[PDB]
Amino acid sequence: RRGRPIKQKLNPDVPMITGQRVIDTFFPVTKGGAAAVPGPFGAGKTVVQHQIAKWSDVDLVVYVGCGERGNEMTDVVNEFPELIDESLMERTVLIANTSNMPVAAREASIYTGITIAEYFRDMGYDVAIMADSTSRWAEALREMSGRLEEMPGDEGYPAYLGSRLAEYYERSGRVIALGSDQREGSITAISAVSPSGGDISEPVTQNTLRVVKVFWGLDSSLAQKRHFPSINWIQSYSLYSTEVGRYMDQILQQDWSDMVTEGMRILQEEEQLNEIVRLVGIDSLSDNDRLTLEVAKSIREDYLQQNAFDDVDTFTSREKQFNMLKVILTFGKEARKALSLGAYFNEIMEGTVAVRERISRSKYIPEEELAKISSINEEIKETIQLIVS
Amino acid sequence: GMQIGKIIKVSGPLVMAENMSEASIQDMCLVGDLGVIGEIIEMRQDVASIQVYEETSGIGPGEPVRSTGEALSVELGPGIISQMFDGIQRPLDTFMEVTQSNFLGRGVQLPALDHEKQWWFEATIEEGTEVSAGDIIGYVDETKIIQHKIMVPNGIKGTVQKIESGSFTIDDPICVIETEQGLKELTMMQKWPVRRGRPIKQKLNPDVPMITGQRVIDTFFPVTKGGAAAVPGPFGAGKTVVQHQIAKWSDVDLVVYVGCGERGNEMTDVVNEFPELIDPNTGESLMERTVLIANTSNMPVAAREASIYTGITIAEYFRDMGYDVAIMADSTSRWAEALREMSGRLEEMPGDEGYPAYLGSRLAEYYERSGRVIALGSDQREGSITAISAVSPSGGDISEPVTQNTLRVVKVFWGLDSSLAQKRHFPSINWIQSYSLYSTEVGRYMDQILQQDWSDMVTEGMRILQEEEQLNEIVRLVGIDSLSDNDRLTLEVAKSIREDYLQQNAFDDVDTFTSREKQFNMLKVILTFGKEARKALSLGAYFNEIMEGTVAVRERISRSKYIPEEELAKISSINEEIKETIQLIVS
Amino acid sequence: MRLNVNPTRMELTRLKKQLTTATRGHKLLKDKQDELMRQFILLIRKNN
Amino acid sequence: AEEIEKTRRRVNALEYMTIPQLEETIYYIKMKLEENERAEVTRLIKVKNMG
Amino acid sequence: INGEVINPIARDYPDEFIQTGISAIDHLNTLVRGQKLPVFSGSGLPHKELAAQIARQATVLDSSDDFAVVFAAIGITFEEAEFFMEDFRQTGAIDRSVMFMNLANDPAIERIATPRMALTAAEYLAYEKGMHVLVIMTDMTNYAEALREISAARREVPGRRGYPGYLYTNLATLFERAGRIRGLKGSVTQIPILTMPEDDKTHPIPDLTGYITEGQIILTRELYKSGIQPPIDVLPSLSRLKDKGTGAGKTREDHAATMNQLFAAYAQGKQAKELAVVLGESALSDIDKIYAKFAERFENEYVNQGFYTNRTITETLDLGWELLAMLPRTELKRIKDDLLDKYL
Amino acid sequence: EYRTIKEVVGPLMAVEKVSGVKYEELIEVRMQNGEIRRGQVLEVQEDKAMVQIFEGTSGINLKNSSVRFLGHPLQLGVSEDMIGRVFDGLGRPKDNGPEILPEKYLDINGEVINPIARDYPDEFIQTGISAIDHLNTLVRGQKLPVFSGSGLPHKELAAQIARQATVLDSSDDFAVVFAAIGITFEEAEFFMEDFRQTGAIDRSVMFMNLANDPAIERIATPRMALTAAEYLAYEKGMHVLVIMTDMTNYAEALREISAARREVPGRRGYPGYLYTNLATLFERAGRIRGLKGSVTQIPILTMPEDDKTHPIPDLTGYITEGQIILTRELYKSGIQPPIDVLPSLSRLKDKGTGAGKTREDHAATMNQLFAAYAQGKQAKELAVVLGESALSDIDKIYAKFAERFENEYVNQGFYTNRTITETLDLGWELLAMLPRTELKRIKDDLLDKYLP
Amino acid sequence: MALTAAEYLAYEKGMHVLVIMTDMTNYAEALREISAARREVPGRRGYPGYLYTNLATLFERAGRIRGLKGSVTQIPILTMPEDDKTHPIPDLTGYITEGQIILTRELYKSGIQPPI
Ligand SMILES: Nc1ncnc2c1ncn2[C@@H]1O[C@H](COP(=O)(O)OP(=O)(O)NP(=O)(O)O)[C@@H](O)[C@H]1O
Ligand SMILES: [Mg+2]
Question: Which residues does ATP bind (chain A)?
Fold first, then answer.
């Protein structure tokens, strides 16, 4: 319950690689940052955390199963030694306090995990800590509070709920550890939140949003249509977005920041449109706007949607993410320029069926064959250049 | 009188004191060494539960609780008029002088009125005269405008044994009376609890229209003396002007203005701007017949809740004098917020939207204390209180509890609209949304007094404005040039009613006030124009031709508002012009 | 008959926005309907 | 003529179904949120008085 | 640190214009010396950047007199607090400033103390030293959170929405410690920043704050997600004392008229945009297409100035005119022809 | 006389060292200033009584005030002398007339009629309003409410029935008892002025409670009125009409009292027992076997936000035997009274119509006018949605029928009394609009005698 | 009792066990009755703060153990009050179990069997 001391707290400026396209592009977490995944049951909070435990470029992973399923823990001990990143289990620590184990031990687990994480942080390592889920910890506090006959805060939780959460997250972060060496180490906190009925006005989500800088809000409606990860691109945010764009521009040596802004700008326009559309639209829409809905649809399906269990789609490198998004925006750009020359939506779509299939299946292209993606850009330009004449 | 107890518990706003058996429920008290304001909510044996309305920081057990001996009251006497107070009647001007400080220091206690000042008291009653509550025994010329009548206070019945004119303070004995309890001494001031309504002989129907001189109000949505009006005040709809206009132009003797729990800078304006307002009849400062109550949002919640109650009680005292009083409250939504806070602090069971369950009753209590009445006294003199309240609904949504509960108990609603303000239409009263349930009665009154069908003219002007909203739908769809010749005339009249009549610039010298007589002549020329012009359409003359022909006269109509009250003849002559011109165009 | 939604503060805000949109869309759909109708009347007379 | 019918059906589906449902659901949720707030204060008063 | 209630007849009306350097505020929602003008934001919204910008750029014009800036952080993360400290150091803004930095893992009691510490310091500098003080406080929702925590400790039943009955008195008390006093050289101007939980303006914090303060500036995620920086929505934002700070002698004679016009044209532009979706490209008047393009440019060029761009009032005014110039003179109905001929 | 007040906690007062104190007993508090306040015992335990004071608890000093227990609950002193008189909500004179000499004092909760002793409502009250009398007939002993709204003319209608209502073929054994609940002085003056001017007051008793009277007094008011009613009906053998307005005000006051005790609230914050509480009033309506006389009730209420699902109209609808509905649509049309016969219903109507009671044609005309109006209204609804063209020539006739029905039958003016004969005959005239072949709910024998 | 019987059959007598319990909504109603009678601090709707935990002590008694040949497969049934899946019973139940099969009144009336 004491935070291990440090020399200095630093600003986390290096983006974690999760390999999950939606996170790395639109709502990235840096190394030493804190993110929350609040979502209703079955939305995919657990699977998101497994993906980061598996694929991220931290040195060490502490997975704290707090008040959850026994099977989930046995999945990790059994599957992780069979994986690579050198076995995966060899950089992994597991605290398990399942749903039917003693309630008070849920708090104990969150604390033993972060402390173990801090210990490795001091050694100069990058540590990711997954707490899954912090609602059970809060709910354990709700149980004791009720048993003590304390006066509850909102929804029955103790009034100091917020302060408890802030202690936990403030322990995470990128630091200079004690010692003459002045080592740098990070702790990245990834937390699950399980709001009753998926309603995020509740205290645990609300208090968490005030101390974290990343929010990956999952949507039950996206999960039902099997759009995974079911992150609400409208509702979610990352305060690390601007700094990460810069880091990515430098690394890729392209205008990544701008691509991502246009991506979100298109998604936001789609939202604007769909509101008015769901009551009269489509039949009467302008071609510019019809095009817009298609680029938004390409983003949603071709880029945002990624399956954890597919052999290839389970992970995407940055080099691969950049190439897929370029190909998608290039379509919208080239199509946009054609409409301005006098071509018709219908002409363009009918004439681009084959190329649009390629864009759609680029998520499936192996990392060894990225040229098979970047070469779609030439086909876009030729195909559309041809249709105008 | 004053009762001292001892604090046994301090917990935030809650204080508990023992040895308070001489204290009563709802009594005000000064809490702690310091002496911040509190109220006794509860009593158990000798232990009182006290809500403290100022910071209790630094108060502890063992310190005194001084009980005032009474519940919230006002001092009523010479020295009231022209003063600015807060909600619990703390004298803001005196605070500055005695205190030599810019702050309403906590624990600082000052009497509402000057108890040191000399007043000439002119006795008008004779020795040996039998007296009861309400009888005037003399007067004091308190200001340049208002005469302060000294009434026998409630609870006194007797004969006047000794009385003399001369110079007294409000604390000096000025009269001796033979009661049933032997002899009693009267002074020039009386105390009344702000929550107890001041008694009357009888309450009367308010059937006399108050002349505000604002054309839109007096004509279409009239209030009567003793009536009540509600005015939503969205930002930017010239609400303050409108209030200023009613404050100076209505035929009431006294104005009480209450600021309930206002934004600091917003309240600074009223304090500066009210004294700047000028009485039309004497050209003296309007404050010469105003009592002003000002609370900023950070004043004690007690003060903010008591504000309207304090103001209405003062309004009653002058009402009792046989004056016509006008009480203006801004904003009752904020007063309601004080109640909502108090309900939370009392750990009550909430009514709708967090307000108390007694919100409606609290509001009914307020409004039912305004009205036309016969006051106590042998005179059987009449007096009235007319109440004008602003509401500031959270969304400009009228549907919320405060506004809905007010509309249960008041009969006039003036809807200020910022969209009208944006079109440059002032007063920005929405004439479709607004209403007056005094309309019928006022018209009956007006027909009597004018000997004209004034009520028929109003109904007709309103029918035209309502027809206009229907016609505007068509103008949107088919364009203006597709309407019939008859419909196009209606647009023109309605437009005239809107620009020639409803629009009134407060800052112009003549347009600032319109007499009832002028209002009649102004409205008549417009309806007459519409009438004569409809005739001519019936006789095969074309709309465009009537317009082109009637340029000079329609201008004369548009200047009507500026024609000096002294020279009304020049408005009336326009009728003959309309008919002479129209028939000529029919040729 | 009310829709199958959960009584949350966010749902209320959503439906209220969805309603202001719906209202405005209804007026605009009425406006078109009326335009097409008068354009229709001209052409249907020609047809006849 | 067909496009007129198409617009009529949308106008009507909005005027007679969508707008009413929205309006009725909105009023319902206001009421429910209000009952819950009342339920909470009832339970908080009882909780406090376990003392 | 509690301070005192100012006798109302002792207050002076705000006179001076304050140049925040942000067009969306300076032009359409003007901040005036001694006003209480809050910023209503949300989680994941860049009030951090906005607060830092206002604190760098805040200035009075043609006064050589300089703003003391008192900055309070209430229960904010280390990362947020370090950003503010590095920003003040980086730009030398610290040389004018006093910072009270409260962190999220600091005790609740300290967190409630912070705003009061900061306002006592401001009133000292303003009313003892004669300085002109600008007080910036974020995040006010964190302060209400601590109030709940202490409230429960004393077993007090919550008022509306889980907050103490006395929240209004508590918030009022804080925010009213701002303004000008007659016969005293200096002034305190407050800009409290708060996040509205789940973006709910009905929420007690923004709702009660809105009654106390003189208007509000509102950030929205709708704007933020299209890259509008700062994402200020002009339509629901309001300054209650703008008129006292604008026009001839303070900014320029054309200030008010253009604000009113831009406000309307943007409203009309957004409506035109909708029409485009519902009735289609063709139903749009050529005058309508312009309003559409205007609202687009207005968000993208006028409102979207960037978090590091300091615009003088004159540049802002000039850009507005430039934007209004897209329309026909026939459309600029809320400007006197007197001004149309002078500024185009 | 007890100088033993132990506690005052807002509205409730605790008196210790009591003995022989009983539940619901009436009390008097003689304050330290000689003021007198009445109250009632809510809870009595060991040597402790919880009381609630009507005028509230402000100004009370515990040490120096005393409590007197009266040994009886709240009562009204009843008399035949009450006819022509005006009282407040507690049966205290308001009209500056003599004191009442009572025959007896009755507990205002009254007593429950043995369901076996109860007599089913029978026979006709002529309100003089057509849309009530013909289609939604009031029967002696029935409870038939008016559901209104803000700014609707329920006061005008209340006044009209009050002065017009009569029983045919018998005089004078008809009284009206008028209860005003939480209404403003101006509403109260309108009613009182009207009763006086028309001479109605000569056959009425009035109990006037105003908006700014204490809450407890407000809920006392209808009980005081029903007690006076039962006396007149059962002891003096009168047919009594009890009109109460506005029952929404009643509920709010009940809700106010409930919240002050911090009781658990029902739907929308009204007491959980709102249903029962209203039933204790409305079930006082009736006839008893072997007694001359009846108590008939017309409760009037405004539905909040025009919503019939609100606890006030909804629970009242679950207790009463029909309902008369006033609508905005009709009011904006200048239909006086703006009664909408479609949502309206009298459940007991056939016990008060037919040969010997109204006329033999009554039920058949009612079924027919109703059906025509429903079909007419449905045709109007069709014309609006799809235009004139969607209607059969027959639909147009029906549409025109609906319009005359509204304008000529329902709309009679608030000062026009229609005898049941004038009403039925007018029914026949509107029927003549339709083809005889259309009048399927009416047999040939009636069509032959009456069809114009 | 039932899960003790099943866990015994599976892990001690080596059977593959199917456990069907209905209706779980009644179970949670009983917990509330006791919870209310004890006058514990109530949670949502009067349900106790330990409803999640209590439910998990039933539903987590399922599965398979290394080296033992039996198994416990649980198919609990509940009716969602008011057809509302956000109600605490289905909500918490859903947060514990390994999925859920949902039946809807719409599919049922349309003649679809089973109306999943
Ligand atoms: N990224 C993904 N790719 C493929 N399938 C997924 C993904 N995310 C979720 N799913 C599917 O949805 C199921 C539920 O995901 P899971 O992470 O267990 O939800 P959860 O939000 O953690 N539920 P709970 O633990 O009850 O709050 C998984 O078993 C997968 O079948
Ligand atoms: Mg999970």
Answer: 39-46
